[PDB]
Amino acid sequence: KAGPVQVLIVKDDHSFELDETALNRILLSEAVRDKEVVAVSVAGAFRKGKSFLMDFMLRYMYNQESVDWVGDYNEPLTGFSWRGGSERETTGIQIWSEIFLINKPDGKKVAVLLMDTQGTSDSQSTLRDSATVFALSTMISSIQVYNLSQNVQEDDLQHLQLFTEYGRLAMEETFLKPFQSLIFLVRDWSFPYEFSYGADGGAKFLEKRLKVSGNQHEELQNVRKHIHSCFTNISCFLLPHPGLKVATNPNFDGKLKEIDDEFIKNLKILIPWLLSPESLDIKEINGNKITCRGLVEYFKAYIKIYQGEELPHPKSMLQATAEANNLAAVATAKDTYNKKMEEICGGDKPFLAPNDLQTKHLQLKEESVKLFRGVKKMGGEEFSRRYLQQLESEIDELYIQYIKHNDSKNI
Amino acid sequence: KAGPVQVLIVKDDHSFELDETALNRILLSEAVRDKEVVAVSVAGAFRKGKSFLMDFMLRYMYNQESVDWVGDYNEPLTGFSWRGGSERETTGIQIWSEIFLINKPDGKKVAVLLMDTQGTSDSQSTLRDSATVFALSTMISSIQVYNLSQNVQEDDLQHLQLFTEYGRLAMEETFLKPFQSLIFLVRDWSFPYEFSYGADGGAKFLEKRLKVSGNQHEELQNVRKHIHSCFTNISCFLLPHPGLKVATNPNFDGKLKEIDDEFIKNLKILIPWLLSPESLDIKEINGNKITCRGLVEYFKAYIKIYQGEELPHPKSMLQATAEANNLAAVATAKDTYNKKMEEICGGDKPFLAPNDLQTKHLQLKEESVKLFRGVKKMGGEEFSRRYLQQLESEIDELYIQYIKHNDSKNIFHAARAAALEH
Numbered sequence: 058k059a060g061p062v063q064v065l066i067v068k069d070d071h072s073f074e075l076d077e078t079a080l081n082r083i084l085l086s087e088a089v090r091d092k093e094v095v096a097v098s099v100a101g102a103f104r105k106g107k108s109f110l111m112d113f114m115l116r117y118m119y120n121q122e123s124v125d126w127v128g129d130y131n132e133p134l135t136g137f138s139w140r141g142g143s144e145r146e147t148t149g150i151q152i153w154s155e156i157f158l159i160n161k162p163d164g165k166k167v168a169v170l171l172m173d174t175q176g177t178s179d180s181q182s183t184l185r186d187s188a189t190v191f192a193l194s195t196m197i198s199s200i201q202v203y204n205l206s207q208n209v210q211e212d213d214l215q216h217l218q219l220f221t222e223y224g225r226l227a228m229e230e231t232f233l234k235p236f237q238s239l240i241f242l243v244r245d246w247s248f249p250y251e252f253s254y255g256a257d258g259g260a261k262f263l264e265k266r267l268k269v270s271g272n273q274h275e276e277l278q279n280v281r282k283h284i285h286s287c288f289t290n291i292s293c294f295l296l297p298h299p300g301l302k303v304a305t306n307p308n309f310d311g312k313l314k315e316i317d318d319e320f321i322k323n324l325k326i327l328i329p330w331l332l333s334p335e336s337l338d339i340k341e342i343n344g345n346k347i348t349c350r351g352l353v354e355y356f357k358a359y360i361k362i363y364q365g366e367e368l369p370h371p372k373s374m375l376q377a378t379a380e381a382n383n384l385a386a387v388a389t390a391k392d393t394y395n396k397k398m399e400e401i402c403g404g405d406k407p408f409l410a411p412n413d414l415q416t417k418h419l420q421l422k423e424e425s426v427k428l429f430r431g432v433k434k435m436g437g438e439e440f441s442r443r444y445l446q447q448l449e450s451e452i453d454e455l456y457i458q459y460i461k462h463n464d465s466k467n468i
Numbered sequence: 469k470a471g472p473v474q475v476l477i478v479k480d481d482h483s484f485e486l487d488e489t490a491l492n493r494i495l496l497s498e499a500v501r502d503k504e505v506v507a508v509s510v511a512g513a514f515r516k517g518k519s520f521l522m523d524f525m526l527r528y529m530y531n532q533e534s535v536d537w538v539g540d541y542n543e544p545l546t547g548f549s550w551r552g553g554s555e556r557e558t559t560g561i562q563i564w565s566e567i568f569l570i571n572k573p574d575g576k577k578v579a580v581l582l583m584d585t586q587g588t589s590d591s592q593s594t595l596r597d598s599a600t601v602f603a604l605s606t607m608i609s610s611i612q613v614y615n616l617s618q619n620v621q622e623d624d625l626q627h628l629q630l631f632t633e634y635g636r637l638a639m640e641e642t643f644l645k646p647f648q649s650l651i652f653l654v655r656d657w658s659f660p661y662e663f664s665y666g667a668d669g670g671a672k673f674l675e676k677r678l679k680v681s682g683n684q685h686e687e688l689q690n691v692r693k694h695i696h697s698c699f700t701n702i703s704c705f706l707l708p709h710p711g712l713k714v715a716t717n718p719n720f721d722g723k724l725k726e727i728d729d730e731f732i733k734n735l736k737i738l739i740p741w742l743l744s745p746e747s748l749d750i751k752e753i754n755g756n757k758i759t760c761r762g763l764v765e766y767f768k769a770y771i772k773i774y775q776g777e778e779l780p781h782p783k784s785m786l787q788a789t790a791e792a793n794n795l796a797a798v799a800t801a802k803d804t805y806n807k808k809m810e811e812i813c814g815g816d817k818p819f820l821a822p823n824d825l826q827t828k829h830l831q832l833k834e835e836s837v838k839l840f841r842g843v844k845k846m847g848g849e850e851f852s853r854r855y856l857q858q859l860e861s862e863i864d865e866l867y868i869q870y871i872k873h874n875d876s877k878n879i880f881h882a883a884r885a886a887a888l889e890h
């Protein structure tokens with residue numbers, strides 16, 4: 058019997074593990090391994106109904122040819138594990154064990170893979186944990202549902218930009234856009250009188266939100282340009298709140314009779330708009346359509362890159378800013394020392410007595426140390442200590458170079 | 469008649485202006501200028517009901533002595549401007565024009581100032597805009613209500629850390645904690661079966677969410693340690709959802725008869741909890757209690773700092789990581805060039821003829837450029853181009869230093885060569 062399968066395992070030590078056996082068993086079966094694959098993912102902040110949504114996607118995938126695929130209104134919602142409570146439920150990445158075979162309007166018979174992910178920003182996860190899951194699901198899926206709550210905030214765009222860039226870094230160089238379809242799914246949209254629920258309201262909302270204009274600040278322009286650069290198709294769907302019973306009742310188990318009717322009405326539109334045979338886009342990587350067997354190889358390849366240390370680590374805004382502040386200050390203090398030493402023992406300056414050279418070096422070292430300390434930096438003085446010691450060590454190294462330059466002028 | 473007053477203005481070119489005349493008219497009047505001041509602010513992500521909340525705080529401030537301060541159930545909600553719609557309403561910082569005089573259980577009157585702020589992360593603002601508003605409002609307030617939606621996510625704590633770090637950087641150095649009281653107010657809390665609505669469930673939720681353990685990953689540890697070290701008192705209040713009429717009905721105008729009853733009950737706990745005379749903390753800066761006139765002086769000083777450019781610029785995760793990646797690659801590549809040039813024209817090495825020196829320099833410069841370009845960095849090759857150009861420029865400057873070092877080993881080379889050619 059079909060069920061969810063844990064394929065990306067996140068460990069308590071923040072390491073990642075691919076369950077290759079379970080993955081090979083689902084995607085290398087004879088019926089699917091050679092078919093071109095459509096991979097649908099949902100990702101975004103944790104505790105926002107992602108697994109819940111995926112389980113309605115499952116109902117549609119099993120009952121496409123039925124007018125009432127949304128189900129019996131007394132049927133509980135099953136599949137991927139979903140629940141209330143403040144603590145995360147999904148970890149890593151899970152896929153549905155049954156690969157769906159669908160006929161496109163082309164006549165092409167394609168394999169459809171459904172992928173559910175650990176929400177970002179939970180209380181147990183580093184930024185590297187969250188970015189790796191989100192980048193991997195974007196790199197593997199051909200349709201990425203970016204699940205957002207209520208609105209699209211500038212920090213939603215900055216996270217998307219960080220995660221997609223992290224994905225790009227693990228990918229081979231390419232002249233085409235790295236990714237395919239992205240849907241901004243806005244849950245609990247509260248303003249249907251400003252933009253109607255659904256795809257047409259969402260398209261107008263998103264055009265406004267992502268619009269680049271010349272009078273816009275560069276920081277605002279650049280995040281929008283980066284998002285457009287990454288995806289060949291970007292859509293948006295505004296979804297109503299499903300009712301306070303769905304959000305707050307601990308006995309709720311997914312029965313449609315307990316879900317707000319306007320939510321159901323739009324949910325019935327959203328799922329086929331995402332998953333109908335005409336809207337299923339086959340996965341492509343660097344301009345080649347991928348089969349299920351091909352997808353398995355890329356999954357293994359990408360995880361290995363993220364398991365190693367070839368790529369830089371994503372860092373928080375304060376941590377990354379502190380590091381850049383300190384690196385820039387080291388460079389400035391070191392450059393100051395170099396140019397000041399050139400004034401007293403550059404090539405065109407006379408030989409200096411060794412004791413004089415030492416006195417002037419110690420003075421110029423102290424001046425560069427005071428320059429470094431005086432620059433305002435994020436992170437605090439304790440964070441700076443490592444960079445202060447590096448600075449002093451590199452200046453001491455430079456000094457020995459100058460001892461030898463000076464010595465050459467008295468031979 | 470009393471109303472909201474814009475005191476911090478964010479311009480469309482993202483510059484900041486203090487309307488000192490408006491501020492002075494309010495805080496320097498004879499009635500309040502010399503009274504110790506309590507400042508209450510609300511701040512957080514945009515479009516989350518901050519102004520709405522403040523107008524219910526206004527009702528309390530005006531009707532504390534009335535039996536039913538919350539208002540008639542048919543009375544619309546007014547004061548600071550609030551509304552639905554997805555676009556921001558409040559910009560900058562505004563204060564209420566009427567300063568409330570309140571007697572403490574001690575015996576003398578404090579002045580209470582209410583401050584409403586632009587939500588962070590709206591689509592028209594830079595990170596620096598958001599950071600400056602949130603920092604200024606934290607630095608000026610003695611009670612900061614941090615307004616959050618549904619949960620406390622790790623990105624919420626990273627933003628609070630960044631914003632409070634930005635405020636600390638603009639303050640006088642002190643051995644004391646820089647700020648006083650912080651309230652994590654969680655709107656639309658959905659799990660009362662796990663942590664009950666209000667301040668006791670909030671305290672248990674927040675104690676767990678903010679707990680510092682020496683065994684958590686340093687990234688999670690250090691955010692929590694930072695927040696704890698910034699505030700002398702941190703609490704948390706979990707508020708129910710107000711109902712879909714409040715959230716989605718365009719005709720809603722604040723009438724209590726259209727607000728869910730459980731939200732009202734907790735609202736009636738929250739507001740006196742925040743504002744009761746025995747709960748009002750007098751603003752302290754650098755160990756001194758502050759009067760209204762002193763608060764104006766600090767508002768002027770702090771904004772002057774953020775109007776200048778003495779401080780590091782707040783940057784997005786991608787922007788800051790890309791910068792750090794490129795800065796490190798530049799330093800490595802420049803260091804390599806220096807070390808390789810020392811092998812050939814260090815002080816203890818023989819004179820090199822200018823043509824050999826140039827050829828070797830050009831080889832080593834290319835190897836360093838190749839090293840820089842080979843480093844995997846966030847942000848793209850296009851982002852790195854400013855740093856590649858800077859590296860080539862700094863390498864060229866070092867080369868000229870080496871030309872002079874080398875020439876000094878044989879000043880007569882060109883002259884003697886010319887004399888020997890004959």
Ligand SMILES: Nc1nc2c(ncn2[C@@H]2O[C@H](COP(=O)(O)OP(=O)(O)O)[C@@H](O)[C@H]2O)c(=O)[nH]1
Nearest residue numbers: 103104105106107108109139140141244303304
């Ligand atoms: N407010 C709100 N809650 C939802 C929605 N959809 C599902 N939920 C509830 O969200 C909670 C967590 O759902 P889950 O799918 O496990 O979230 P995930 O962690 O994002 O996968 C459950 O209590 C769901 O009933 C929605 O559209 N809005």
Ligand SMILES: Nc1nc2c(ncn2[C@@H]2O[C@H](COP(=O)(O)OP(=O)(O)O)[C@@H](O)[C@H]2O)c(=O)[nH]1
Nearest residue numbers: 514515516517518519520550551552655714715
């Ligand atoms: N979901 C929800 N909406 C609220 C709450 N409080 C107020 N609102 C609605 O949120 C919208 C924005 O309110 P406003 O005070 O202008 O938000 P601000 O931008 O943060 O100041 C209004 O439509 C309010 O009716 C709440 O606790 N939960």
Ligand code: ALF
Nearest residue numbers: 103104146147176
């Ligand atoms: F909180 Al989750 F899937 F994002 F359980």
Ligand code: ALF
Nearest residue numbers: 514515557558587
């Ligand atoms: F969006 Al606001 F006050 F944060 F109008």
Ligand SMILES: [Mg+2]
Nearest residue numbers: 107108146147
């Ligand atoms: Mg889930």
Ligand SMILES: [Mg+2]
Nearest residue numbers: 518519557558
């Ligand atoms: Mg407001």
